[PDB]
Each structure stands twice: as C-alpha cells, then as structure tokens.
C-alpha cells in the first residue's frame, strides 16, 4: 500500500523533531508512508476515534493509561517484533513489564527521565560558602547560606505539577522507596495519612518559606534560567531541565551539577514515555506499524531522541559516552536502584490523570496557604485520592 504509519504524539519541540524525522526517513526507506497529526498542550478524541474503528497506528500513552487501553482490547500484541528484536534482552525487566498487557508487548518505550534530581550551580555555591547537600537538613542549610550570600535559594515556578514534583521528592526522601510505593502505587491509606507523610508536608511548608511569592504561572525553564544565570543556587526538577542547560550551551560539572534529591540516594524515580500500538485491519498497515515499533527501539532514534533533551535511553546496551556526564550518573544510579526497591515510578508513572489532579490540587492548595496544617493536609490528600479513584 505500502502501508501507513499514523503517529499521534506531542513531541512538538525542535530538538524532538530531529529524532521524529530519523523515524520518518527510515519508515519511508523501508517502503512505507509517513503521516503525523501533532497536537499541543503537553500533559496529555483519540478514544472516540479508536472506539469507532479509526485509530492511529500509534499514540503517546505514558503511565497506567496503557493498562486501561489494553483492557479495552484496543491495542495490538507485538510478539513478533519483540521476538525479532530481542526486546526482552534490551529492556530493563521493570520497564518491559510496564509495556506489557497479559504478558504481551502493547507499547514501545522511548525514554527514561529521572524525577529525583537537584540541579546545582557550583559557582553560586562557592561564592556563598554553600555545601552541596546530601540530607534534607543540609538542603535547608544550603538554602540559608545562599540567602545569607544574597542569592535566590530555590528557583521554583508556579505550576501545580511543579509543586508536586517537589512534594513527591520529599515523599521519596522521608518515606524511602517502599513507603513512596505504598503511597503513590497502592494509594495506601495508613501511609497517606501517617506521621511521615505528615512530615513530608511539614518539610514542603518549610521549603515554601524560601520560595518566591511572585512565582505564579512561571514555567520550569524560567526557574532553571535563574539558576543558569547565576542568580539562584538550586532547582528541584527532573532531568528534562538539562535541555534548558544545553540550549544555553552549558556542560556537565563545569557549569552545573546533578545530585540526587537529598536523602533519595539509592533510589531512582523514573518517568517513561511510550507509544502504544493500536489493533489495525490492513495487513500492509500492520507491517508499517511493526517497523515503527522496531525502529523506535533501535540505537539511532534512542540516541537522538534522548540527546538534546536529557533523558536516558531505555536500551541497556547503549554507548553512553554519546551522552552528557549527568546522563551517565543517571545511567549509574538507575542500575543501583534497579538492584532493589530503589527503582520506583514517579507519581506521573504511578497513577491515573484523575488521581494526579487530586494530588496536584491538595498540594498546591496547601503550599499556597501559609497557615495550612500538615496534620490536615494528609486528610485532604487521602480524601481527594479516594474520590478520584
């Protein structure tokens, strides 16, 4: 036909086009047709279109949104392409499991972000006599010292997802991997209303006190800029924030440092993006689909897509010297975490959009209220999470 690949995705950026193009050019070269329809409003009509027999060949669906679409029977089993390309050998076990439904590949993963980073301006630290933290006590001690030296201690933007990034970090730090998993994967009631979650909010509140009150609306890349430009000391963010650093022409260690969010050493909170493959009717369109799935997990796209963006590739067998120094620390930390309970889904991997919304809402509401009681915030957390489920 020669068969058509229609991919619904949100990879809008110029850096992400380089990779998408490498995909297109190879599909064409393999004798198939390319077509895309790239929407925007990042964060996530496809349903109505797939529940009515006009799906795209592929769509961007991260988190649990895969199990739901699988369970509807709308996705296609990729046993053949998996088998031909030794997918089980290439993927970390926990990653492969996220991509399966009834033991069958239904989606191909394309990246691994780490959520639990702190980004550090080593020039700002030296001029402030500040010490790169490894504990929460030390994170505050650095914050004080930066303020005392007349820097913005924490660069932080006014969007709910960013408030909860910082929250989920604190949950991980205080509760450790197991408790984090109890809270965001199992939505365990005792955990979400317990003393340590309460401590996570108390610590959130306390981080609040060092944040700019005129942050409302502000994007993560503006907060990163305050760090890049030598005006702030730190930002707590996932490793997408490297893009901002790259685009400014920085390096690894010479301009910034990446450390694990204090107290989360040992753990890797992953954030994994993916293309779920729909059940199609045309044989040629299947062959195209299977090609897109193969190539999305080949070295060429796995390198370009994750490069100039900050995430790790999901393939285990990569030439990592192709990446920056922070991605190499991220690759090392991944493996350590992977030996045990340390590897956990970020909150964004770990629940439904409705539950996220509930948490985002509780967190921002409590962080935007200087009188808010942590003892109260855990009841709000739990009650909202119950209601969204």
Short description:
Helix content is about 50%, strand content about 10%. Helix 9 packs antiparallel against helix 11. About 50% of the residues are buried.
Explained architecture:
This is Probable sugar-binding periplasmic protein. The protein has about 400 residues and is an alpha/beta fold. It folds into 2 domains: about 1-115 and about 270-345, D-Maltodextrin-Binding Protein, domain 2 (3-Layer(aba) Sandwich), CATH 3.40.190; about 115-270 and about 350-389, D-Maltodextrin-Binding Protein, domain 2 (3-Layer(aba) Sandwich), CATH 3.40.190.10. It is about 50% helix and about 10% strand. It has 19 helices and 14 strands. It has helices at about 15-30, 45-50, 65-70, 80-85, 85-90, 95-100, 120-130, 135-150, 160-185, 190, 195-210, 220-230, 240-245, 285-295, 300-305, 325-340, 345-350, 355-365, 375-389; strands at about 5-10, 35, 60, 100, 105, 105-110, 115, 115-120, 150-155, 230-235, 255-260, 270, 275, 345. The strands form 4 sheets. A 5-stranded mixed β-sheet has the order 2-1-3-13-6. It has a 4-stranded mixed β-sheet with strand order 9-10-8-11, with helices on both faces. α1 (about 15-30) runs antiparallel to α15 and α9 (about 160-185) packs antiparallel against α11 (about 195-210). It is globular. The chain starts with a strand and ends with a helix. About 50% of the residues are buried.
